[PDB]
Symmetry: D2
Subunit: 257 residues, 4 copies
């Protein structure tokens, strides 16, 4: 496959509906060797089962709020892998208050801090901690959403954090690019995952994108996964600092009128 030989670390695989699950499945199909992170002891058994499905026993804890766990992740990983070819950052979090209702009602200094720390800072933080073991043709991928670009109701503080995340893709690309490392994001359309499940208005967004996107259909983790595998691969060696929409074209219309 077009990732033969490539060693790829994936964060964010929480259930079999996770975007990271789709990316894992496509990377394994194309020949990559995988490793996984998880957060919290109670998920160790579950992520171990997913790793095994993808032919791997490489699982490591990493809460990206914690500098020591980010350093320990790569210290552990390096006892197995000489080098790392791919990193998938599929991590987002804001306190519930901050993505419900009115933007200002949910705004506090701490809600802002936490949303930007986990959803944006953690991507270049993982990149920096990985760099000593990154291969020269490595590829780093994160997941963003259209709320970075345009204001979407309720996304609120997460939209600010995703805009900072997309900017980090560009500054990472410059930092890491003379070495040869590529950095990109997929701006994925709405997909019913665990994270999406806490958003009251999510059903309405899904209906709206189905009715108004050019392809008149919502995207799947298989579609996001295949685009992810492409970006992580040498097929995409001309592509860096890009935010690729995988959203049935929804970003490119004015819908619903």
């Amino acid at each position: 496959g077009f990732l033969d030989g490539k060693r790829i670390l994936l964060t964010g695989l929480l259930s079999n509906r996770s975007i990271a699950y789709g990316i894992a499945k496509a990377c394994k199909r194309e020949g990559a060797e995988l490793a996984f992170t998880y957060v919290g002891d109670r998920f160790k058994d579950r992520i171990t089962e997913f790793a095994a499905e993808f032919g791997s026993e490489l699982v490591f804890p990493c809460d990206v709020a914690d500098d020591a766990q980010i350093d320990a992740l790569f210290a552990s990983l390096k006892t197995h892998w000489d080098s790392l070819d791919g990193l998938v950052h599929s991590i987002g979090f804001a306190p519930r208050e901050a993505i419900a209702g009115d933007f200002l009602d949910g705004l506090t200094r701490e809600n802002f801090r936490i949303a930007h720390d986990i959803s944006a800072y953690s991507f270049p933080a993982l990149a920096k901690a990985a760099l000593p073991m990154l291969s020269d043709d490595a590829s780093l991928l994160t997941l963003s959403y259209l709320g970075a670009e345009r204001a979407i109701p309720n996304y609120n503080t997460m939209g600010l954090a995703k805009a900072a995340l997309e900017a980090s893709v560009r500054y990472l690309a410059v930092s890491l690019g003379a070495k040869g490392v590529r950095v990109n994001a997929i701006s994925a359309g709405p997909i019913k995952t665990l994270a999406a499940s806490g958003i009251k208005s999510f059903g309405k967004i899904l209906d709206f994108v189905e009715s108004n996107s050019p392809l008149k259909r919502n995207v799947t983790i298989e579609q996001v996964g295949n685009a992810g595998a492409f970006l992580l691969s040498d097929l995409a060696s001309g592509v860096t600092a890009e935010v690729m929409h995988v959203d049935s074209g929804f970003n490119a219309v004015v819908g619903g009128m």
Copy 2:
């Protein structure tokens, strides 16, 4: 003038080269009544002199790192003004390490936190604290830079924070807009201010913009000030959620080839 009657609070007026000085001068010319903030006791005399130049004795301390000072600012201001028509956010800060050299070399969780707290969070934080006294046709303005949109060497962590700031303009515009309040940014070209003065490569940026911008000249605080006054005024009542470039057109070219 086209701001007659309007009461406008300006942050960030540090010296007579500050962008906020240019905006102050243009707003006063067009008829507004002004008030000012400062940070740190040693600047009280200086900002009092600037306020007096603009016919005002309304000066208030406000370090935007501190929730209590943000609340105290508007509690003080309201003992003078029933209502507020304009707010100018002209505040930026990152630790020096984070805007020098390589992006990852200057990246730490705390540098990221501080840059986003002061340069991005503080704008919607001031808006929220102001809201109880905002007039229905009020106008809020912040200052951004092209480094939000594209990666510029050394701007680094500030570019992430300005991307979050520009997103806050859009989410603020939606939050405050049913009331009638407008929210915009000016993406200003390079101007030799105190903040610019700590950037070793700033002379080179200024030369590059002079040689390659469409107007073949750098912008002034008078030009940024006039565009600011326009956005704060009822002339701009159709304009919200906008990031207006005031940069001699530099953002719109590929220069230097």
Copy 3:
């Protein structure tokens, strides 16, 4: 006013609902001297009445399909004015077939040709013909629509032509900018004009923008006019190659979900 002394030629003033009427009214208020173009003998009396309302008897025919009429326009104008400070291009046309229904159903080589000739080519064509008499601080303004940026149903071939028009703003800005001439567009929200009146779905667009824009209201020719006058003025001397949205913020949201 802030256009005192400025001599401004306005195209596209067809009725008192025209965007060019709003721009005319704001420019006259701010002190400019005006001149006007029209298309077709039967409109000479009407445009003469509008010119007189704005204190001017300067009216000239100009169908922008015709090179000879574009040259004759400036030859005539120069017998009155030594120099020209402002040009407002408020001209759009596509054959009806090309802005109804499905994009491909309305697509033909000739419909494409005509839409791009009148709606896009004519702006830099007028600029070139004006250049010998442009003042060094002159300002050229055109009108665009969000359909240039994103696909909007029915706008179809006009969306292609407006994207070429917005690109012409950038290339004009570079061509004319060393002289000191600025070039900008306003991307106006929907306004019920004669041109809008032939679009069956226009009522629905107006309702949608009223419900979903940040300011929860449609824009007026007074709002577009005031932003136009600003851009044509020395207040905006730092601004060129810009496409300014004057659309109640609608461009910056995802609406209707």
Copy 4:
């Protein structure tokens, strides 16, 4: 390969440095069946040799200035293929005057007409003529350049035409998407092809992109080809109305300062 079974028609393969050659080579590798167009009798032998290299004898004349040749192309092709799965539009032209020197010096109504007719109109014109035989999962791809987005010296009238081309990608995506057909562009970085060879400043652009792009290297037709094959494939079934940069990240920086 990931295009097994797919039948793809490629325009624009002029020499073995053509972008269309790279796309052809990658599509054949991934399993597609190919067909080719050419312009002008003297190139029939050459394109026949290229087709044979890709295991095909399917070659057809098509000058996209001529409606009859566009119709005859698909009438011919359909005698071989029941259905068409991919179309590569890799066609650009402007008169030499219009891409040299100053934008206005090279501007005439006819130069504008020709540049937009060949470089922009022809893409949706081919799509429309193909539609009766397009498969429901077909994929249409065109090639654009950063000069659509920002003004680049000398690109001039081609930049307007590429902006109209990128808009056609969005309107095509909506027109064709309910059927299931995807439409995208690659915005390719500079590559030394025959078309590039007539541009005096091209060496300087290539040097500038090598020095300033994030990956500090120019792109190849292999890189553009691999990204093209991806977009033409079912791997990219979530992606439509997208303009993908394949340019070593150059679009995302401000370079050369």
